[PDB]
Design a binder for this molecule. Sequence first.
Ligand SMILES: [Mg+2]
Ligand SMILES: [Mg+2]
Ligand SMILES: [Mg+2]
Ligand SMILES: [Mg+2]
Ligand SMILES: [Mg+2]
Ligand SMILES: [Mg+2]
Ligand SMILES: [Mg+2]
Ligand SMILES: [Mg+2]
Lengths: 164, 164, 164, 164
Amino acid sequence: MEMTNAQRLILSNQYKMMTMLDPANAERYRRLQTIIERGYGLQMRELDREFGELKEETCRTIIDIMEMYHALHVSWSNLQDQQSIDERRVTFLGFDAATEARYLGYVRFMVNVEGRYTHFDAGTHGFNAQTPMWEKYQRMLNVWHACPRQYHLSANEINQIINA
Amino acid sequence: MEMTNAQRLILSNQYKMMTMLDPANAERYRRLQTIIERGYGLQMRELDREFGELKEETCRTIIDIMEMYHALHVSWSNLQDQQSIDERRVTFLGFDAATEARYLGYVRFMVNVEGRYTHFDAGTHGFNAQTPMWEKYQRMLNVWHACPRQYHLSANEINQIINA
Amino acid sequence: MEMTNAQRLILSNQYKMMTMLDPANAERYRRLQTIIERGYGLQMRELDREFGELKEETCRTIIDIMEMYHALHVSWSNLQDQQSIDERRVTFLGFDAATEARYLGYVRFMVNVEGRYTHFDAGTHGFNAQTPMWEKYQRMLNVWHACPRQYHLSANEINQIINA
Amino acid sequence: MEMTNAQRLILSNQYKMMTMLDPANAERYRRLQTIIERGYGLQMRELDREFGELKEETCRTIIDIMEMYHALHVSWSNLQDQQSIDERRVTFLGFDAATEARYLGYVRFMVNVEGRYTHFDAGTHGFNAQTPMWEKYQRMLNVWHACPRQYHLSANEINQIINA
Ligand SMILES: [Mg+2]
Ligand SMILES: [Mg+2]
Ligand SMILES: [Mg+2]
Ligand SMILES: [Mg+2]
Ligand SMILES: [Mg+2]
Ligand SMILES: [Mg+2]
Ligand SMILES: [Mg+2]
Ligand SMILES: [Mg+2]
């Protein structure tokens, strides 16, 4: 992680300030300060990986998937004849903790921190689907966005979407 | 937002420090810290939108409009015969809150914070003209700057300016 | 000022922290914060003006001029015969406050803060020569650096230098 | 130092904050602040030298040298007949304090701060070899990495490595 000298000075000063404000953790700060001041490249790389990225459009796709399930569930709940469509199929199961952790994390963030989609059933494992779901959701979105309405959907439309 | 990782580290450290200094708002800072650390692109873009821009020359134009009204009002008050020029026409009415908010904001900043043009009549709504004025003011400035003097204006000159 | 939005966020956070640490000056910090957040271009430019530049080589030239006077004064005081050479001529008078302020400021910094050349006679006005001296000093340096020794100068050499 | 003005403002604000937090050292900070604000180039360059660099791959090489000595020492201890093979030769002596200070410092950091290779014999001088070792270690690594096993080495292999 490079990282101009001027930035190193700024960071160095921060670790000094953090030591002043929070001496309980001086060890932690002096260590980082040393890494930054001396330009220990290995440890600097390792710092660099504390920082992730989840692209805007990916964030939006996740939110849209949740919105799709909102549209599906409401639509289902207003069907005269729930044409033997199981509620589970119209319920957002979330993402796989093992392979889709970034995505799962974002859902949890959107719900627990931001406060969105709070009336969703989290399931038994806080939206951990336990199977990969990303590819499925993409295909569902495609069918959903292709419908002439997205909300108040017919049983037919619901089935096309959930079976994508 | 196009942050480098070094900048993300700096910001992250700030939110930690702000939590130390102001624990009442730990929630607010922990959230921003998460957004920055994890690189949640959607949330980062929304961070970017909090920062506006009002170009130097636009700032100066606004100040100049106010200065023009100063020149106009002073000129008028020193007219031997105020040739039926209503004071209202020689009074800075400000900007439209609905479509010219940035401009209105700057006027208020220049007056209330900076302390300039304190003796101006703010009107009943703190310089909310309630109609767009920007285009009018530009035409007035053109006539005003074209006068061979800008101050101690003749009634004739005053009329040309206010009728631009 | 050409700030990126990330930098504006960093600065904004600093002004919030400075308000926490030093509430006596909340108004000053609050005002800067507004300027930065809203991107008020005029005020941002005026912010830029707070920051000067004095190039490395200019800094070094000033220090060297002082060192030259050290060499001159020691040389003079060690002379069996000071050939009617006035001590004043071998004394660093400093710089013109009115036209050479940057230079005068640096001398004062080097002496009062850094602690260098503290045995120099500051004169009655803290190294303010109150005539411009920069061009003279340049010519003196040229003669001085051209001398085969720079120290333990002969009366002859001293005269060539001070008369440059 | 190649600081932008925005960075200078950030740094200047830090030194203000550090003075608030730690007034005992106001002098230290006021001085740096002056250097930064006024752009005193000489002193600004001297700041830069406070920051060092030790490339990632060099950091890794040092760690690998230590790991090599771990592999060597364990292998030797497990030897049923140490065709002895003085233990001294299979012990990491460190780096020369006088010419390999950057390296020596990194070892000390990895051991004392990070907590790695804590069972290593530090010798009488905390890994100061007092002779240059860098070139030797490189040749040893070359032989070591060329062995089909890196660990559980034969006495033969140990000798090839230590004699590289
Ligand atoms: Mg790694
Ligand atoms: Mg949000
Ligand atoms: Mg938006
Ligand atoms: Mg203009
Ligand atoms: Mg101003
Ligand atoms: Mg110095
Ligand atoms: Mg030097
Ligand atoms: Mg490590």
